[PDB]
Amino acid sequence: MFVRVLEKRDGTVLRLQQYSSGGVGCVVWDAAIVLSKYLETPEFSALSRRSVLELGSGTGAVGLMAATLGADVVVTDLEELQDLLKMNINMNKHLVTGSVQAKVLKWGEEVPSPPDFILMADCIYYEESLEPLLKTLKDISGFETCIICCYEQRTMGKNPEIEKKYFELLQLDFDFEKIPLEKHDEEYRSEDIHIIYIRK
Amino acid sequence: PNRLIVDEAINEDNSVVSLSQPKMDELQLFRGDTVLLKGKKRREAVCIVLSDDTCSDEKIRMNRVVRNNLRVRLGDVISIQPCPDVKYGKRIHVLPIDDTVEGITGNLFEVYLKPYFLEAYRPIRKGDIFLVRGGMRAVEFKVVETDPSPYCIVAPDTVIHCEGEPIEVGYDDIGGCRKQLAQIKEMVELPLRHPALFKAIGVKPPRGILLYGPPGTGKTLIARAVANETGAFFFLINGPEIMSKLAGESESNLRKAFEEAEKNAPAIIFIDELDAIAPKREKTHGEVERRIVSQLLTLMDGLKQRAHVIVMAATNRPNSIDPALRRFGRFDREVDIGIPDATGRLEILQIHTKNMKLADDVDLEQVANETHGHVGADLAALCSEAALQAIRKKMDLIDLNSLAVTMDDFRWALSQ
Ligand SMILES: Nc1ncnc2c1ncn2[C@@H]1O[C@H](COP(=O)(O)OP(=O)(O)O)[C@@H](O)[C@H]1O
Ligand SMILES: Nc1ncnc2c1ncn2[C@@H]1O[C@H](CSCC[C@H](N)C(=O)O)[C@@H](O)[C@H]1O
Numbered sequence: 017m018f019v020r021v022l023e024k025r026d027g028t029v030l031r032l033q034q035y036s037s038g039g040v041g042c043v044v045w046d047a048a049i050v051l052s053k054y055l056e057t058p059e060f061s062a063l064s065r066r067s068v069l070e071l072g073s074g075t076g077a078v079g080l081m082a083a084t085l086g087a088d089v090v091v092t093d094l095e096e097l098q099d100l101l102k103m104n105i106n107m108n109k110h111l112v113t114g115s116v117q118a119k120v121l122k123w124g125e126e127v128p129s130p131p132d133f134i135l136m137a138d139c140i141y142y143e144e145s146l147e148p149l150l151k152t153l154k155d156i157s158g159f160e161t162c163i164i165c166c167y168e169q170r171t172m173g174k175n176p177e178i179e180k181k182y183f184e185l186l187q188l189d190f191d192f193e194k195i196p197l198e199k200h201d202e203e204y205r206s207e208d209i210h211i212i213y214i215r216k
Numbered sequence: 217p218n219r220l221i222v223d224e225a226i227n228e229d230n231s232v233v234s235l236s237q238p239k240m241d242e243l244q245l246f247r248g249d250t251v252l253l254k255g256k257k258r259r260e261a262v263c264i265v266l267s268d269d270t271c272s273d274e275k276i277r278m279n280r281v282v283r284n285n286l287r288v289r290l291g292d293v294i295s296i297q298p299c300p301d302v303k304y305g306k307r308i309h310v311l312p313i314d315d316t317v318e319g320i321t322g323n324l325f326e327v328y329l330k331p332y333f334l335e336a337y338r339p340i341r342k343g344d345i346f347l348v349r350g351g352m353r354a355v356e357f358k359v360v361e362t363d364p365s366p367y368c369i370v371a372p373d374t375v376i377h378c379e380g381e382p383i384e385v386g387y388d389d390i391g392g393c394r395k396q397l398a399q400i401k402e403m404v405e406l407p408l409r410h411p412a413l414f415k416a417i418g419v420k421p422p423r424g425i426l427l428y429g430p431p432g433t434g435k436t437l438i439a440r441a442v443a444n445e446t447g448a449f450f451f452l453i454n455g456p457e458i459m460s461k462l463a464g465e466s467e468s469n470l471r472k473a474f475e476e477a478e479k480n481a482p483a484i485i486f487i488d489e490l491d492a493i494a495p496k497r498e499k500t501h502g503e504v505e506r507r508i509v510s511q512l513l514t515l516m517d518g519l520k521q522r523a524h525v526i527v528m529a530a531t532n533r534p535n536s537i538d539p540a541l542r543r544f545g546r547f548d549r550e551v552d553i554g555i556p557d558a559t560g561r562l563e564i565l566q567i568h569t570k571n572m573k574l575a576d577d578v579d580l581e582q583v584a585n586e587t588h589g590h591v592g593a594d595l596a597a598l599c600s601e602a603a604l605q606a607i608r609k610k611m612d613l614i615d616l617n618s619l620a621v622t623m624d625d626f627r628w629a630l631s632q
Contacts (some may be wrong), residue, residue: 172498
């Protein structure tokens with residue numbers, strides 16, 4: 017297991033344990049770094065004492081980042097990730113200023129009162145990112161929820177048609193905008209990784 | 217003909233190498249034949265040969281133990297020949313590699329060596345390093361002495377004896393790319409000669425350099441000459457060798473490299489065959505692909521702006537690289553190493569004829585003028601082929617010291 021340090025604008029370091037062995041959510045992906053670093057931007061701020069749900073949390077990278085900015089966040093992923101999520105919470109407990117807790121949530125199922133933000137990073141990549149994920153997103157989301165989706169535009173085999181359909185379905189219940197590349201973190205940004213905003 | 221290309225073993229036994237049956241017919245070799253194998257640095261090994269259906273005819277399957285014994289890598293070339301008269305050894309002297317027995321106690325012979333040699337009739341050579349798995353830990357052992365003088369077959373009567381525990385290139389060797397060499401020398405001078413001037417000046421140093429090209433263009437040579445002549449530690453990663461290991465064995469490899477590059481900084485980490493490690497694979501939900509790229513991107517983002525560790529990696533297919541490598545200023549410089557033109561070949565041929573006594577009649581530019589799709593590797597082979605034909609000519613003078621190589625010897629080499 018190898019540890020990503022994720023440096024914060026204020027100097028503290030998030031440390032995410034990663035496993036070269038498990039499923040895809042056992043390493044930090046670059047959409048995670050992009051999203052995390054974007055939450056830290058001046059034009060963003062504003063997470064303090066707010067309700068954050070993270071889907072596809074995997075390593076916990078983004079949810080943990082939000083937990084250190086003052087939010088009350090629930091990091092959710094499949095049963096296989098709960099022990100990593102918990103290990104990574106323990107790794108960073110000393111920096112959580114709001115609150116964080118690990119829960120199981122498989123998309124297309126149900127488990128509150130609607131959350132302020134919903135954060136996703138690199139969740140749109142296979143069959144379950146389609147009908148099941150939008151079910152969960154259509155459910156949890158109130159009308160004043162700000163869902164923020166971060167993902168890497170991929171070009172190989174089954175990935176581009178999942179990304180195509182996923183926006184062909186998002187129009188059914190949701191309005192979306194893509195935030196320009198220059199509002200991303202100055203250094204941790206890339207022409208092929210997209211931060212997009214959702215409402216309704 | 218008896219020169220073969222080293223491939224991965226499916227038959228992961230130490231004592232076994234595999235060829236295709238058509239190849240085994242061309243050498244008149246049969247299953248269970250003891251064979252002698254020759255590799256690099258004058259290293260030799262004694263194995264049993266077997267058939268294998270899934271094996272290109274020009275290749276030999278051999279496990280990692282034998283490859284290390286021959287000092288050779290995947291894609292390299294070994295020789296094979298019959299070894300008929302391997303007699304049964306009377307007593308062997310064997311010790312364990314200290315790296316592998318640290319912090320273990322027990323009857324080393326009962327746990328490891330007895331069940332390893334037992335009724336197997338293994339061929340062994342003095343100086344072999346063998347690994348014996350099983351036993352809560354895999355220990356590697358070394359053959360220090362045999363009872364036949366070299367070679368032996370460890371038969372039941374053989375008695376086993378065990379006590380103790382055992383343990384420069386430069387710029388003038390690179391031809392045909394005097395431009396691209398200066399372009400790398402320049403990417404790397406400031407970060408390896410004046411690291412701290414990057415915080416001071418306030419500028420982001422290079423972390424990764426991609427060298428593109430076809431096999432044989434000398435990309436490993438370039439990197440090692442950059443490291444030896446700027447005073448930099450050098451750590452080689454071979455793509456398919458690290459991928460050949462178990463996930464976890466390679467994760468230990470990859471970590472070790474960055475550990476040692478920083479323990480010896482300024483250092484250059486060189487990754488031969490980047491696409492063996494970081495393909496442009498698709499991505500779906502599975503446990504089935506190992507996450508080596510992420511380990512590597514994690515170790516490289518962790519180096520940050522210290523600038524004392526530079527990572528160079530080479531590939532034959534640039535559009536076949538995981539795009540994650542080219543973002544956040546990881547691999548954001550790329551130099552191209554192509555076939556040399558006519559002047560480039562001549563540059564290379566003077567380098568490879570450097571310690572060969574050349575005839576008066578030798579016109580190295582004519583050789584150059586007739587070597588088109590040739591890369592430095594082919595020009596090297598062409599020179600050794602010519603000196604080999606010089607040696608075979610003095611060999612025929614047993615019709616009853618040193619050597620001298622003529623243009624005829626080269627004319628033989630240009631005609632394969
Ligand atoms: N441009 C060159 N100048 C001098 N020697 C070369 C050159 N290209 C290849 N060689 C010879 O070929 C050998 C292997 O080249 P290598 O560094 O493995 O290239 P690559 O990494 O592109 O496959 C070198 O050790 C050297 O003997
Ligand atoms: N149907 C589903 N329900 C819940 N989680 C899922 C899911 N399908 C995939 N996942 C999770 O989705 C995540 C996508 S991998 C991305 C992990 C994280 N965004 C990071 O960048 O580090 C994985 O952690 C996987 O465990």
